[PDB]
């Protein structure tokens, strides 16, 4: 009955593409799960097809729910739980979060290295929905009937499919189904019966927890070593953090009996989970929140803290009736007051050169052989581009197919940008401006939040890799031979980016990337950046701190929309740098400096640029 509800909410809308291909959605999607049921040899799909189908009690009859382990009682419970989980989560396209008059063509979420590139209103033919169903069906046929494996098939085919073919629909059908699923699996963990649902009690009783966790002291976790620490360490030190993070999230999910579908987003080392508000959950988090802080202390004392708060909410606090934004307000407040009170250094060195051949990590007991690096509750075991995955959960890298992974192993797909090139260093720090304001008052429901939250991570977990290996702007470096950015990434996640490389590509790249960010957000968000330049061997910690000081400069600017490149206090706009510093003004220049306002600034730097393009 838990799984039934997991996949039930997951598959309730499955016939949208099936009706939108001409094979309602409740009548079509159901044949689909019956066809698939009588075409693979698992009737489970036959019983699940009923969630789409919704006479009732005699269609639950015709199928004999007890051939699994399911009382006709249990089955009606999940049919209503899921019904209203669909209502809580609240030949056309899926419009964009940012611009609601541009829209994309249904593309796949794992074909071509890309899946964006939308355009003015193009409304989708049946032929399109017919090759989609051609796939989905195959991957449905070959998948295990279990969330961890069913989620990424839906993620894969339905990301760029509209959950309701209303116009300006920002919510993809995959963010609908997950939320529907997230919410169902928790009602059920929160003991809603059909009696409660009908009475509208899963809609005013505060039956859910909105669990939220957010890391602090990351800057001082990731950046704190001196000479001892190559790019091989900084990357795996950054990787170990995601792993701490995953280890908290997967443990929360272990112990509250949930799915990855409940993970609204987990971006930046900041996470949101939807959960049953019960007292054995609250008393189960208290023990995660407490065990994991104890552990982050004993192993880093105060350098790294993870604050986890939770705020019980009602079903109508997923939507607006502005109630979601409020719950998040008290939870962000709650969250805020929750902070302010060498063998690892070496296990991470092995990792940073394994990193180029790594395909995942198995997640196991800390006392399990293979373990390279341990998190609060679990050990991790690098799954290598040679060997065989080895965990109860396997955090698989950059891809939504499990492939050569064992069954008894929750497939956990996780995206990370790692472009990396296999007289100074060029260091970028970039952070999307005021973004935690866009999330409260632009997205003020739980699905839009997940919707929006998922495109950002996409941009910083994937798209960013493509400006690195497919760069266009090059006014300093020059077009010449089509070559990628001479760079590595240390972190690209949340809304924060830290890239090292060739002094010049980095300057161009913060720009080109801000550029994409500009297009990809259609002007709707901004980024400020530090860029600094450094000799060779220097306290990474100090390259952090100084480039941080630059962005802090760029950030203390009014309107917050530029870069503070030159360590000097003379920042410019993304296209004030490009238009006037570079496209206009950029021994004689050497003496110019020794001699001694909007233009004097843009001249000041242009010369600094000119210089830097030539020394040696
Ligand atoms: N996994 C990672 N690997 C490498 N660098 C990271 C990683 N995650 C985050 N960062 C960076 C990007 C963010 O700007 C920064 C967040 O800083 P943090 O140490 O949390 O203090 P802060 O002053 O920015 O605010 P707060 O402590 O309240 O979150 O850490
Ligand atoms: N991929 C994502 N999904 C969901 N939320 C995200 C994502 N990335 C970032 N966030 C949210 C969570 C954080 O509270 C916030 C981080 O933004 P950050 O740049 O640190 O501060 P801010 O943008 O809110 O204001 P400012 O940058 O001006 O201090 O954005
Ligand atoms: Mg940030």
DSSP string, 34-49: HHHHTTTT-THHHHHH
Rounded CA separation 526/130 (Å):
38
In this structure, what token pair is assigned to residue 595? 């001699």
Exposure string over 499-518, b if 16+ CB within 10 A, otherwise e: bbbbbbbbbbbbbbbbbbbb
Rounded CA separation 588/575 (Å):
27
Distance of CA 80 to the CA centre of its chain: 30
For the chain, give every residue range classified as CATH 3.30.70.270: 425-612
Distance from residue 495's CA to the centre of ligand 2 (Å) = 6
Per DSSP bridges, beta strands 305-313 and 373-374 are unpaired
Nearest CA to ligand 1 atom 20: 216
Structural contact between residues 354 and 384, judged by C-beta atoms closer than 8 angstroms: yes
DSSP string, 200-229: TGGGTS--EEEEEEEEESHHHHHS---SS-
For this entry, resolution in Å reads 3.0
Structural contact between residues 311 and 210, judged by C-beta atoms closer than 8 angstroms: yes
3 state DSSP class of 399: coil
Fold type of domain 425-612: Alpha-Beta Plaits (3.30.70)
In this structure, what token pair is assigned to residue 550? 């630059």
Distances (CA, A) of 256 to 162, 260, 288, 546: 30, 12, 11, 43
Structural contact between residues 298 and 309, judged by C-beta atoms closer than 8 angstroms: no
Nearest CA to ligand 2 atom 8: 494
Exposure string over 144-179, b if 16+ CB within 10 A, otherwise e: ebbbbbbbbbbbbbbbbbbbebeeebbbbbbbbbbb
CA angle 364, 305, 450 (to 5 degrees): 75
Rounded CA separation 361/371 (Å):
9
Rounded CA separation 148/85 (Å):
19
**Residues in the chain, how many?**
616
Rounded CA separation 302/613 (Å):
43
Distance from residue 583's CA to the centre of ligand 2 (Å) = 32
Fold type of domain 206-414: Alpha-Beta Plaits (3.30.70)
Kindly state if the Cβ of 271 falls inside 6 Å of ligand 2: no
Nearest CA to ligand 1 atom 25: 216
3 state DSSP class of 147: helix
Nearest to 428 by CA among 351, 365, 510: 510
Rounded CA separation 602/261 (Å):
49
Phi/psi of residue 245, each to 5°? -60, -55
Rounded CA separation 573/565 (Å):
11
DSSP string, 267-306: ETTEEEEEEE--HHHHHHHHHHHHHHHHHHHHHHTTS-EE
Structural contact between residues 426 and 501, judged by C-beta atoms closer than 8 angstroms: yes
Ligand 1 neighbours by CB, cut-off 6 Å: 215-219, 222, 238, 241-242, 269, 431, 490-491, 493, 496, 498
Rounded CA separation 56/51 (Å):
11
In this structure, what token pair is assigned to residue 59? 């269609």
Phi/psi of residue 136, each to 5°? -25, -50
In this structure, what token pair is assigned to residue 46? 């036959």
Structural contact between residues 179 and 89, judged by C-beta atoms closer than 8 angstroms: yes
Distance from residue 362's CA to the centre of ligand 1 (Å) = 25
Structural contact between residues 498 and 428, judged by C-beta atoms closer than 8 angstroms: yes
Rounded CA separation 552/572 (Å):
13
Kindly state if the Cβ of 456 falls inside 6 Å of ligand 2: yes
3 state DSSP class of 411: strand
DSSP single-letter state for residue 357: G
Structural contact between residues 325 and 445, judged by C-beta atoms closer than 8 angstroms: no
What atom in ligand 1 is closest to the CA of residue 221? 19
Contacts of 46 (CB under 8 A, 6+ apart): 33, 34, 37, 38, 63
What atom in ligand 2 is closest to the CA of residue 555? 28
Per DSSP bridges, beta strands 265-267 and 102-104 are unpaired
Rounded CA separation 515/484 (Å):
16
Q: Sign of the C-alpha dihedral, residues 39, 42, 43, 44?
A: negative
Rounded CA separation 392/384 (Å):
16
Distance from residue 220's CA to the centre of ligand 1 (Å) = 8
Nearest CA to ligand 2 atom 1: 457
Rounded CA separation 307/290 (Å):
10
Structural contact between residues 445 and 324, judged by C-beta atoms closer than 8 angstroms: yes
Structural contact between residues 385 and 357, judged by C-beta atoms closer than 8 angstroms: yes
Note the ligand closest to the C-alpha atom of 219: 1
Rounded CA separation 471/511 (Å):
11
Distance from residue 547's CA to the centre of ligand 1 (Å) = 14
Phi-psi region of 339 (alpha: psi -120 to 50; beta: other; left: phi over 0): beta
SS3 annotation, 530-584: EEEEECCCCCHHHHHHHHHHHHHHHHHCCCCCEEECCCCCCCEEHHHHHHHHHHH
DSSP string, 451-489: HHHHHHHHIIIIIHHHHHHS----TTT-SSS----SEEE
DSSP single-letter state for residue 318: S
Contacts of 380 (CB under 8 A, 6+ apart): 243, 247, 361, 362, 363, 364, 371, 372, 373, 374, 391, 395
Contacts of 345 (CB under 8 A, 6+ apart): 225, 233
Nearest CA to ligand 2 atom 24: 436
In this structure, what token pair is assigned to residue 491? 């972190």
Q: Sign of the C-alpha dihedral, residues 476, 477, 483, 485?
A: negative
Rounded CA separation 41/50 (Å):
17
Rounded CA separation 485/502 (Å):
8
In this structure, what token pair is assigned to residue 248? 């908290």
In this structure, what token pair is assigned to residue 420? 């990396």
Rounded CA separation 45/43 (Å):
5
Phi-psi region of 158 (alpha: psi -120 to 50; beta: other; left: phi over 0): alpha
Nearest CA to ligand 1 atom 10: 218
Structural contact between residues 602 and 573, judged by C-beta atoms closer than 8 angstroms: no
């Amino acid at each position: 009955i838990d799984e039934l509800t997991a996949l039930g909410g997951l598959l309730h809308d499955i016939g949208k593409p099936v009706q939108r291909a001409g094979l309602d959605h409740s009548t079509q999607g159901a044949r689909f799960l019956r066809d698939l049921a009588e075409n693979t040899g698992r009737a489970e799909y036959e019983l699940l097809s009923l969630f789409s189908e919704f006479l009732m009690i005699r269609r639950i009859k015709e199928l004999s729910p007890e051939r699994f382990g399911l009382t006709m009682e249990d089955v009606l419970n999940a049919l209503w739980i899921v019904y209203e989980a669909d209502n809580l989560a609240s030949s056309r396209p899926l419009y964009s979060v940012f611009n609601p008059g541009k829209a994309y063509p249904w593309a796949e979420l794992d074909f071509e290295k890309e899946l964006p590139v939308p355009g003015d209103v193009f409304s989708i033919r049946s032929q399109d929905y017919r090759e989609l169903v051609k796939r989905l069906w195959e991957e449905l046929s070959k998948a295990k009937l279990r969330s961890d494996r069913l989620l990424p098939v839906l993620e894969k085919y339905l990301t760029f499919v509209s959950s309701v073919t209303s116009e300006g629909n920002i919510i993809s059908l995959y963010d609908h189904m997950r939320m529907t699923s997230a919410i169902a699996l928790a009602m059920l963990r929160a003991g809603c019966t059909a009696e409660d649902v009908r009475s509208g009690r899963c809609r005013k009783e505060k039956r859910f927890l909105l669990i939220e966790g957010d890391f602090s002291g990351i800057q001082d976790f990731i950046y704190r070593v001196s000479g001892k620490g190559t790019l091989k360490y900084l990357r795996a030190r950054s990787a170990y953090l995601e792993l701490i993070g995953w280890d908290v999230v997967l443990e929360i999910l272990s112990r509250l009996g949930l799915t990855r579908a409940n993970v609204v987003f987990n971006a930046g080392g900041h996470f949101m989970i939807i959960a049953q508000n019960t007292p054995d959950a609250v008393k189960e988090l208290e023990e995660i929140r407490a065990k994991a802080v104890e552990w982050l202390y004993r192993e880093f004392e105060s350098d790294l803290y993870l604050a986890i708060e939770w705020e019980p909410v009602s079903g109508r606090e997923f939507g607006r009736e502005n109630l979601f934004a409020e719950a998040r307000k008290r939870l962000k407040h709650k969250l805020t007051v929750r902070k302010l009170k060498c063998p690892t250094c070496n296990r991470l060195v092995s990792l940073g050169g394994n990193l180029p051949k790594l395909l995942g990590f198995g997640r196991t007991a800390k006392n399990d052989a293979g373990v390279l690096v341990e998190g609060p509750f679990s050990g991790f075991v690098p799954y290598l581009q040679g060997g065989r995955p080895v965990g109860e959960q396997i955090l698989v890298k950059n891809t939504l197919n499990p492939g050569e992974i064992p069954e008894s192993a929750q497939f956990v797909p996780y995206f990370v940008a790692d472009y990396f090139k296999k007289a100074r260093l060029g260091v970028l720090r970039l952070d999307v401006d005021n973004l935690g304001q866009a999330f409260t008052h632009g997205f003020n429901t739980i699905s839009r939040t997940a919707a929006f939250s998922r495109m950002l991570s996409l941009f910083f977990r994937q798209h960013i890799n493509y400006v690195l290996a497919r760069p266009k702007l090059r006014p300093i470096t020059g077009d010449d031979p089509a070559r990628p950015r001479e760079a590595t990434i240390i972190y690209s996640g949340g809304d924060d980016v830290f890239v090292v490389g060739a002094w010049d590509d980095v300057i161009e790249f913060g720009i080109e990337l801000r550029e994409r960010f500009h297009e990809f957000t259609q002007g709707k968000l901004t980024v400020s950046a530090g860029i600094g330049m450094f000799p060779d061997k220097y306290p990474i910690s100090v390259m952090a701190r100084e480039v941080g000081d630059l962005e802090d400069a760029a950030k203390s600017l009014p309107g917050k929309n530029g870069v503070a490149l030159f360590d000097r206090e003379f920042t410019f706009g993304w296209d004030e740098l490009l238009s006037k510093v570079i496209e206009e003004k950029y021994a004689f220049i050497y003496k110019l400096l020794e001699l001694l306002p909007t233009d004097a600034k843009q001249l000041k730097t242009a010369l600094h640029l000119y210089i830097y393009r030539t020394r040696k």
